From Swiss-Prot, chain A:
Zn(2+) binds at residues 180-181. Homodimer upon hormone binding. Interacts with SMARCA1. Interacts with GH1. Interacts with CSH. Interacts with NEK3 and VAV2 and this interaction is prolactin-dependent. This is Prolactin receptor. Residues 1-197 are extracellular. This is a receptor for the anterior pituitary hormone prolactin (PRL). Acts as a prosurvival factor for spermatozoa by inhibiting sperm capacitation through suppression of SRC kinase activation and stimulation of AKT. Isoform 4 is unable to transduce prolactin signaling. Isoform 6 is unable to transduce prolactin signaling. Belongs to the type I cytokine receptor family. Type 1 subfamily. A motif (WSXWS motif) lies at residues 184-188.
From Swiss-Prot, chain B:
Changing residue 112 to G: In KWKS; loss of activity. Disulfide bonds join 53-161, 178-185. Changing residue 175 to M: In short stature; idiopathic autosomal. Belongs to the somatotropin/prolactin family. This is Somatotropin. The lineage of its organism: Eukaryota, Metazoa, Chordata, Craniata, Vertebrata. Changing residue 27 to I: In IGHD1B; reduced ability to activate the JAK/STAT pathway. InterPro entries: 4_helix_cytokine-like_core, Somatotropin, Somatotropin/Prolactin, Somatotropin_CS.
Length: 197, 186
């Protein structure tokens, strides 16, 4: 239909075990309720936590988190009784946190030029040891002056080297991560540097 | 004769699981997007009837905890059942996968990848033997089928399921690659 009133603009699970959804009164108007029904199987269900989420949130803890199941949700907001409708599959709603300790290091090989030397580390929330995940990293570097950045895909490897680096300038560098079929992370904080001579 | 390390043996399967996983995501996004797109959306999920997948008659884990609960052999097996189970349905899906703007689709004749992956896994499985009973969960090869006239809703119904099943397979192997192949994980 044409209108609809409140929008659920997203859901994001910080690790494939819990998820939060955020709605939005697109309405120029304790008058809202969230109800969901899992895949297939017909019972309606009211939202289970409206505290851990921030206002206009419905947080699904552990008994409510189910893998490989569609979630049919719709906000029921009345004071003006309206609605909308969304299908959320948890495996594709994952968005982790930025990596830690971007350790830069400018190195110096025997006769040739100076190259950088980065190393980083995964965000906290995700525990890879018994491996529910696969992180996918990226790095960007733009020298002080510079306009747009230059992006290198580090892959499943947490270390990296960028050749052809000139004494004369100073750069910035950020690393980032994404779980295999999910969402890119925020850019970690820029660790400035200066190439030697 | 250098008896191939598990490094490669797992490493190699992970890409196959993965091509199978993207193929199904893309095409499905591709398909829902074109045929069966708006208020009609989830008619495949209409009511119980339609929605359920024949690739559900195999008891698969549904959380971290319990998916971390099935032994390396236990986990490997489901993956396989899944493969075999999707060996036929996907025959009817050629239609689907063929005019797919989504590259590799056509060229990569899906029954092949399934077939390939299928061997990779028995192998991974065998090497995780040394001979005890093959006891735990599913005993016999729980090989099912759905059917074989709403033509259009049906293809679509399948795509949803493949995507889902491609996913269970990748996710599981990854656990075993990590837990067994002590290194390239963390
Ligand atoms: Zn993948």
């Amino acid at each position: 239909l044409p209108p609809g009133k409140p929008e659920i603009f997203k859901c994001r699970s910080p690790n494939k075990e819990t998820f939060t959804c955020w709605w939005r009164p697109g309405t120029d108007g304790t008058n809202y309720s969230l109800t969901y029904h899992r895949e297939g199987e017909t019972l309606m269900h009211e939202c289970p936590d409206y505290i851990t989420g921030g206002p206009n949130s419905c947080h699904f803890g552990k008994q409510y988190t189910s893998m490989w199941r569609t979630y049919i949700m719709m906000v029921n907001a009345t004071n003006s009784s309206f609605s909308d409708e969304l299908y959320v599959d948890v495996t594709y709603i994952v968005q982790p946190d930025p990596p830690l300790e971007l350790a830069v290091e400018v190195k110096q090989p025997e006769d040739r030029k100076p190259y950088l030397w980065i190393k980083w580390s995964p965000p906290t929330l995700i525990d890879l040891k018994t491996g529910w995940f696969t992180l996918l990293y990226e790095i960007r570097l733009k020298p002080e002056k510079a306009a747009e950045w230059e992006i290198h895909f580090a892959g499943q490897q947490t270390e990296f080297k960028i050749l052809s680096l000139h004494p004369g300038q100073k750069y910035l560098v950020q690393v980032r991560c994404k779980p295999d079929h999910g969402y890119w992370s925020a850019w970690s904080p820029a660790t400035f540097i200066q190439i030697p001579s | 004769f250098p008896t191939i390390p598990l490094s490669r043996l797992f490493d190699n399967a992970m890409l196959r699981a993965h091509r199978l996983h993207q193929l199904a995501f893309d095409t499905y996004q591709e398909f829902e997007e074109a045929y069966i797109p708006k208020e009609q959306k989830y008619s495949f999920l209409q009511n119980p009837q339609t929605s359920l997948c024949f690739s559900e008659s195999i008891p698969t884990p549904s959380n971290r905890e319990e998916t971390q609960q099935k032994s390396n052999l236990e986990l490997l097996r489901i993956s396989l059942l899944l493969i075999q189970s999707w060996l036929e349905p996907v025959q009817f899906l050629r239609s689907v996968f063929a005019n797919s703007l989504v590259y590799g689709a056509s060229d990569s004749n899906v029954y092949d990848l399934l077939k390939d992956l299928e061997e990779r896994i028995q192998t991974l499985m065998g090497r995780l033997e040394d001979g005890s009973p093959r006891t735990g969960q599913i005993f016999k090869q729980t090989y099912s089928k759905f059917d074989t006239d709403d033509a259009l809703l049906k293809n679509y119904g399948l795509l949803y399921c493949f995507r889902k099943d491609m996913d269970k397979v990748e996710t599981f192997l990854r656990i075993v690659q990590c837990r067994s192949v002590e290194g390239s994980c963390g």
